[PDB]
Design an enzyme around this catalytic site. Structure first.
Site, short mmCIF file in Angstrom:
data_model
loop_
_atom_site.label_atom_id
_atom_site.label_comp_id
_atom_site.label_asym_id
_atom_site.label_seq_id
_atom_site.Cartn_x
_atom_site.Cartn_y
_atom_site.Cartn_z
CB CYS A 115 -64.32 10.58 8.90
SG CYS A 115 -64.75 12.30 8.58
NE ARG A 141 -60.42 9.41 7.88
CZ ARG A 141 -59.82 8.23 7.72
NH1 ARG A 141 -58.85 7.86 8.55
NH2 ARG A 141 -60.19 7.43 6.74
CD1 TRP A 154 -68.44 19.81 4.20
CD2 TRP A 154 -67.54 21.20 5.71
NE1 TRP A 154 -67.09 19.90 3.94
CE2 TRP A 154 -66.51 20.74 4.85
CE3 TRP A 154 -67.21 22.09 6.74
CZ2 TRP A 154 -65.18 21.14 4.99
CZ3 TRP A 154 -65.87 22.49 6.89
CH2 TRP A 154 -64.88 22.01 6.02
CD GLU A 185 -72.86 12.49 5.19
OE1 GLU A 185 -72.22 13.50 4.80
OE2 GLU A 185 -73.00 12.18 6.39
C1 HEM Z 1 -65.87 18.84 7.56
C2 HEM Z 1 -66.42 17.84 6.82
C3 HEM Z 1 -66.58 16.46 7.09
C4 HEM Z 1 -67.05 15.60 6.14
C5 HEM Z 1 -67.42 15.94 4.72
C6 HEM Z 1 -67.24 14.31 6.76
C7 HEM Z 1 -67.85 13.26 6.12
C8 HEM Z 1 -68.10 12.03 6.70
C9 HEM Z 1 -68.89 11.00 6.05
C10 HEM Z 1 -69.44 10.92 4.62
C11 HEM Z 1 -69.04 10.06 7.01
C12 HEM Z 1 -69.94 8.88 6.90
C13 HEM Z 1 -71.38 9.31 7.09
C14 HEM Z 1 -72.29 8.12 7.16
O1 HEM Z 1 -72.15 7.23 6.30
O2 HEM Z 1 -73.14 8.06 8.08
C15 HEM Z 1 -68.31 10.41 8.21
C16 HEM Z 1 -68.18 9.61 9.35
C17 HEM Z 1 -67.45 10.00 10.49
N1 HEM Z 1 -66.82 11.23 10.63
FE1 HEM Z 1 -66.83 12.75 9.35
N2 HEM Z 1 -66.87 14.34 8.10
C18 HEM Z 1 -66.49 15.66 8.33
C19 HEM Z 1 -66.22 16.14 9.60
C20 HEM Z 1 -66.11 15.33 10.75
C21 HEM Z 1 -65.66 15.83 12.04
C22 HEM Z 1 -65.57 17.29 12.45
C23 HEM Z 1 -65.34 14.71 12.80
C24 HEM Z 1 -64.81 14.62 14.11
C25 HEM Z 1 -64.25 15.59 14.87
C26 HEM Z 1 -65.65 13.56 11.98
C27 HEM Z 1 -65.60 12.23 12.46
C28 HEM Z 1 -66.18 11.13 11.84
C29 HEM Z 1 -66.41 9.86 12.47
C30 HEM Z 1 -66.10 9.40 13.90
C31 HEM Z 1 -67.19 9.17 11.62
C32 HEM Z 1 -67.82 7.81 11.84
C33 HEM Z 1 -69.14 7.87 12.61
C34 HEM Z 1 -70.00 6.66 12.34
O3 HEM Z 1 -69.47 5.53 12.38
O4 HEM Z 1 -71.22 6.84 12.09
N3 HEM Z 1 -66.17 13.94 10.74
N4 HEM Z 1 -67.77 11.67 8.03
N1 LIG Z 2 -70.77 15.08 7.02
C1 LIG Z 2 -70.95 14.61 8.25
N2 LIG Z 2 -70.33 15.20 9.28
N3 LIG Z 2 -71.74 13.56 8.44
C2 LIG Z 2 -72.03 12.95 9.73
C3 LIG Z 2 -73.05 11.85 9.58
C4 LIG Z 2 -74.30 12.38 8.91
C5 LIG Z 2 -75.36 11.31 8.65
N4 LIG Z 2 -74.85 10.27 7.70
C6 LIG Z 2 -76.62 11.97 8.09
O1 LIG Z 2 -76.98 11.65 6.94
O2 LIG Z 2 -77.21 12.81 8.81
#
Ligand code: HEM
Ligand SMILES: NC(=[NH2+])NCCC[C@H](N)C(=O)O
Ligand code: HEM
Ligand SMILES: C[C@H](O)[C@H](O)[C@H]1CNc2nc(N)[nH]c(=O)c2N1
Ligand SMILES: C[C@H](O)[C@H](O)[C@H]1CNc2nc(N)[nH]c(=O)c2N1
Ligand SMILES: NC(=[NH2+])NCCC[C@H](N)C(=O)O
Ligand SMILES: C[As](C)(=O)[O-]
Ligand SMILES: C[As](C)(=O)[O-]
Ligand SMILES: [Zn+2]
Lengths: 416, 414
Positions: free
Chosen positions: A120, A123, A292, A297
Site C-alpha cells: 500500500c 500508508r 481513495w 490504478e
Molecule cells: C487512503 C488512501 C489509500 C491509498 C491512496 C492507497 C493506495 C494503494 C495502492 C495504489 C495499492 C495498490 C493497488 C493495486 O495495485 O491494486 C494499495 C494496496 C493495498 N492497500 Fe491501500 N491505499 C489507501 C488506503 C488503504 C486502506 C484504508 C487500507 C487498509 C485499512 C489499505 C491497505 C492496503 C493493502 C492490504 C493493500 C494490498 C492489497 C492487494 O494486495 O491487492 N489501503 N493501496
Molecule cells: N486506493 C485503493 N484503496 N486501492 C485499492 C485497490 C483498487 C484496485 N487497484 C482498483 O483499481 O480498483
C-alpha cells in the site's frame, strides 16, 4: 557495520538500516538460492482453511505478542494492566481455545495491519482510519446494512474517508463470515458467444457466480455487481446495492472533447473486501476496507491492461496516432492522456483522488517517518512504483526491504 | 522446490527448474526480500592477492568444462577427458589454469545469457568475442579498446562485442578499466556546488583531471580512458573523435527541441564489470551492444540526479509545471524519449524502443523455458522506467538467481 539490511536511495545518496525486519515472525517466499519477489501470490501467507482449532501453543504466542504490541503503543508495557490482560488471554485460550479483542485493541490492530501493508502506497494516512466494529453481526442481511453504512460514510459525497468494517472472527468447526466479491464495488464481466468479454474481464467469475445464485444480469459495460454475503454455515445471499449509495464519475478529457464521447466511467470507492485481517492470531475473514484511488490504478491498470478494458488502441486511433509501429510510443502517448482524464474527471466531480507523483512523494515522507518510529518500513518495490512513469517518481530510486509483520492483511482462498 | 511462475496477462504458467543449478547465493532470505537493492552488501569480488582454494577453483572448472562439452555435443568424448586432465594438471601445479579461446567464447556468451538484468538477451547467441589476453600494457589495452569501439560501432549499424583482457592473478594487480563505460560525458563540479555535464561521472571526471587531463567546460564532453596495467598507476588516453559516433537530438514535430542542443553517444559499453568463467576472473572484460531508448531518454536525461532536463522541456512545451496532477512530467518524458528514437533513427544508428525490446525478451523467456527450463530475470530492471505495465514484462512473474558463467560487480580500483 550494522548487521541489518543497508538501504540506499540512489537519488539523494542517503543511507538507512532496517532493523524493523528483525521483528518479522513469518518467513516469506525468498531463499538465498533464488528470489521470488515479483510473484503476486507466493504460496506463503496463504491462510488456508484450517479446520481443526489452531495449536493452542501457537495461537497463544501470537496472542501474547499482539498484546505486548498494544501496551507498547500505549506506553504501558510491563505494567499490571498489561500482565493482567496477558493472564486474561491465556486463561480464555485455556478454556475455549480462542479469545476476544477489546474495542481499542481491534482499532489498534486494524491500523497496524494497514501500517504493515507492504503493497500500500497510501500508508502515510495509516493513523487516520475509521474502524467500524461489527463482531455482533449475525446475518448475511445484517452484513448488507453494515456494508451500506460503510459505503455511505467512506464515500461522504465525494470527500472520501478511510475505513474498515470488521465482522466476526473464525470459530473452530464453525463456518466463516465471507464476502465473495473481491471489492465492494466492481463491474461485471459478460462472457460472449465469440468468447470475448463485455465489461470488466477481471470480474467474469464472480459475475457467473452471481447469476448461478439468482441475479438477473444486465448487459452494459459498466454494470455494478450485486453482493454475495456469506454468514456462517449458510449458502450466500444475494444483495443489490442501492444506486444512490454507489457514487460514480463519468470520464472526460480536459481538452480532447471526444474523450467524453467514449462513454468511459469509474466508481469512486475502492474497497478491497476479500482479504483476511489477522490480529494476534485471531482471523477476521470478512473485514472490507477502503480509502481513495490513486489515478494510475484506473487510468493505467483497469483501463489499459490487455486483460481489462484494454482501451489503449481505441484512444490512440482517436488521437490519430500511428498504431502500426511501437517506435511512435503511441501506447505511451495515449496512456498519458487517459490518466489525465481520470485525474481531471475526479477533480471536476469533486471526488478524492491522488496522482502517482503526489502519492509516491507522500510515501517517501511515510518512509522517513517510519524510519524514526520503527527503524524501517516493509515495502514491495514492484508494487510501490507506479505502472507509468516509474523513474519519474521518487520511489523508483529508493531501495526497499520487504518482509511480513503482524497484524496484517493476507490473501485467502475463495469461499467456493 | 521448483517455483511456479505465472503471467497475469495471458494466464500461462511454468516451473523454473533451472534455478536448481544455482551454486551462488543472493541477498534474500525467508525473513526478508532484498531484491530491489542494486549492489550486493557482500557478494563483492574481494581482492585476489592470494590464490583461491585448489578444491573450490577445481570444481567450478570441472563444471564449466562439462558445460562447454555439452554445448558442442562432445560430452564424455576423449577430448573432454583430456581437457579435464589438462585442467586438473594445471591447477595442481600452478594453483590455476587457462581457457582455450573457444571455451572463452563459450563463457562470454553464457555470461550474457545468465545476466538477470539484461533485457537484450535474445541476442545472446550473436556475440563477437575479442581475445585480448595477450595484452601486457595500458597502451595495448587502448588499441584493443579502440578496435572494439570501431568494430562495435560499425558506422551506426552496431554489433554486440566483448573484449577480454588478462585474467586476475594471485599477488598481482588486476588489469582494470577505471571508467564505468567506454564512453561517458564529463561531470564538472562548478561554483554553487552544482554540476555541469553528467553528475554521475563527477568522480571519474575528477580522477582524470588529477592524472593530467585538460578538462573542458561542456555538458557533453567525451571523457578520456584511464586504463591501468597491473600494479601500475593508470594511464590517460584520449579517444579519437571519429571513433566516437554521437547523435544530435531533435524532435519529429517540435521544431524548438533541437535548440536545447542535446546529444548522446551511440555505443553503450559497460567496462567496470567482472567476467567470471569456470572460477577464473577477468577484472577487465568490456562489452557492448546497443541502446534501448529509455536508457537515454528516461534515466540519463530525466533522472533528477543526471541531466535532469525534465522541467526545461516542460516549460518549452508550455506546460502547467505548477501542479503534479497536470502530468507535465509524464508528458515531457514521452517526447524526450520520442526524440531519442527519432534522432537515432534519423542518424541511422541502432536503437530499440522499450516496447519492441520487452517483446523480444518475452520470446527469449519462451525460448529459454524450452532450452533450460527457466530464465533468471530481475523484474525491477527488466521492466522499463516508464510505461511499465504498458509493456508485457510488467505482467510477467520472474525468478532471480545466480548462474555461472556470469557478470558480477567488483570494487572500484581507487
Ligand atoms: C487512503 C488512501 C489509500 C491509498 C491512496 C492507497 C493506495 C494503494 C495502492 C495504489 C495499492 C495498490 C493497488 C493495486 O495495485 O491494486 C494499495 C494496496 C493495498 N492497500 Fe491501500 N491505499 C489507501 C488506503 C488503504 C486502506 C484504508 C487500507 C487498509 C485499512 C489499505 C491497505 C492496503 C493493502 C492490504 C493493500 C494490498 C492489497 C492487494 O494486495 O491487492 N489501503 N493501496
Ligand atoms: N486506493 C485503493 N484503496 N486501492 C485499492 C485497490 C483498487 C484496485 N487497484 C482498483 O483499481 O480498483
Ligand atoms: C544487443 C543489445 C543489448 C541490449 C538492447 C541490452 C539492454 C540492456 C538493458 C536495458 C540493461 C539495463 C541497463 C541499465 O539500466 O543500466 C542491460 C543490462 C545488462 N546487459 Fe545488456 N543489452 C544488450 C547487450 C549486452 C551484451 C553484449 C552484454 C554482454 C556481453 C550485456 C550484458 C548485460 C549485463 C551484465 C547487464 C547488467 C549491467 C549492470 O548491472 O549494470 N548486454 N542490458
Ligand atoms: C507480475 C508482476 O508481479 C505483476 O504484474 C505486479 C507488478 N506490480 C504491481 N503493482 C501494483 N500496485 N499492482 C499490481 O497489480 C502489480 N502487478
Ligand atoms: C533502487 C532501485 O532498485 C533502482 O533504482 C533500480 C530500479 N530499476 C532499474 N532498472 C534498470 N533497467 N536499471 C537500473 O539501474 C534500475 N535501478
Ligand atoms: N543497452 C546497453 N548495452 N546498456 C548498457 C547500460 C547502459 C546505461 N544504462 C546507459 O544508459 O549508459
Ligand atoms: C475520436 As474517437 C474516433
Ligand atoms: C525551446 As523553448 C526554450
Ligand atoms: Zn527476494
Amino acid at each position: 557495520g550494522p548487521k541489518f539490511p543497508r538501504v540506499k536511495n540512489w537519488e539523494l545518496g542517503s543511507i538507512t538500516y532496517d532493523t524493523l525486519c528483525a521483528q518479522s515472525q513469518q518467513d516469506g517466499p525468498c531463499t538465498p538460492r533464488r528470489c521470488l519477489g515479483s510473484l503476486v501470490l507466493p504460496r506463503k501467507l496463504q491462510t488456508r482453511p484450517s479446520p481443526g482449532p489452531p495449536p493452542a501453543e501457537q495461537l497463544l504466542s501470537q496472542a501474547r505478542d499482539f498484546i505486548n504490541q498494544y501496551y507498547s503503543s500505549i506506553k504501558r508495557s510491563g505494567s499490571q494492566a498489561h500482565e493482567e490482560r496477558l493472564q486474561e488471554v491465556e486463561a480464555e485460550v485455556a478454556s475455549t481455545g480462542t479469545y476476544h479483542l477489546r474495542e481499542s485493541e481491534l482499532v489498534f490492530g486494524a491500523k497496524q495491519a494497514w501500517r504493515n501493508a507492504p503493497r500500500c502506497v497510501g500508508r502515510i494516512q495509516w493513523g487516520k482510519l475509521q474502524v467500524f466494529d461489527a463482531r455482533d453481526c449475525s446475518s448475511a442481511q445484517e452484513m448488507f446494512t453494515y456494508i451500506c453504512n460503510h459505503i455511505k460514510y467512506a464515500t461522504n459525497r465525494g470527500n472520501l474517508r478511510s475505513a474498515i468494517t470488521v465482522f466476526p472472527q473464525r470459530a473452530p468447526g464453525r463456518g466463516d463470515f465471507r464476502i465473495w466479491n473481491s471489492q465492494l464495488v466492481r463491474y461485471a464481466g459478460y462472457r460472449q458467444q465469440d468468447g470475448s468479454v463485455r465489461g470488466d474481464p477481471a470480474n467474469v467469475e464472480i459475475t457467473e457466480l452471481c447469476i448461478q445464485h439468482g441475479w438477473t444480469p444486465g448487459n452494459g459495460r459498466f454494470d455494478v455487481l450485486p453482493l454475495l454475503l456469506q454468514a456462517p454455515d449458510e449458502a450466500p445471499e444475494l444483495f443489490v446495492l442501492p444506486p444512490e449509495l454507489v457514487l460514480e464519475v463519468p470520464l472526460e478529457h480536459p481538452t480532447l472533447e471526444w474523450f467524453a464521447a467514449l462513454g468511459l466511467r469509474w466508481y469512486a470507492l475502492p474497497a478491497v473486501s476479500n482479504m483476511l485481517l489477522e490480529i494476534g492470531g485471531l482471523e477476521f475473514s470478512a473485514a472490507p476496507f477502503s480509502g481513495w484511488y490513486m489515478s494510475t490504478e484506473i487510468g493505467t491498470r483497469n483501463l489499459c491492461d490487455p486483460h481489462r478494458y484494454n482501451i489503449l488502441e481505441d484512444v490512440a486511433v482517436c488521437m490519430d496516432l500511428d498504431t502500426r509501429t511501437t517506435s511512435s510510443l503511441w501506447k505511451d502517448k495515449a496512456a498519458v492522456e487517459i490518466n489525465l482524464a481520470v485525474l481531471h474527471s475526479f477533480q471536476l466531480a469533486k471526488v478524492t483522488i491522488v496522482d502517482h507523483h503526489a502519492a509516491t512523494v507522500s510515501f517517501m515522507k511515510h518512509l522517513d517517518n517510519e524510519q524514526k518510529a520503527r527503524g524501517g518500513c516493509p515495502a514491495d518495490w514492484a508494487w510501490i512504483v507506479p505502472p507509468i512513469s516509474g523513474s519519474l517518481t521518487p520511489v523508483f530510486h529508493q531501495e526497499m526491504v520487504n518482509y511480513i509483520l503482524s497484524p496484517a492483511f493476507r490473501y485467502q482462498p475463495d469461499p467456493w
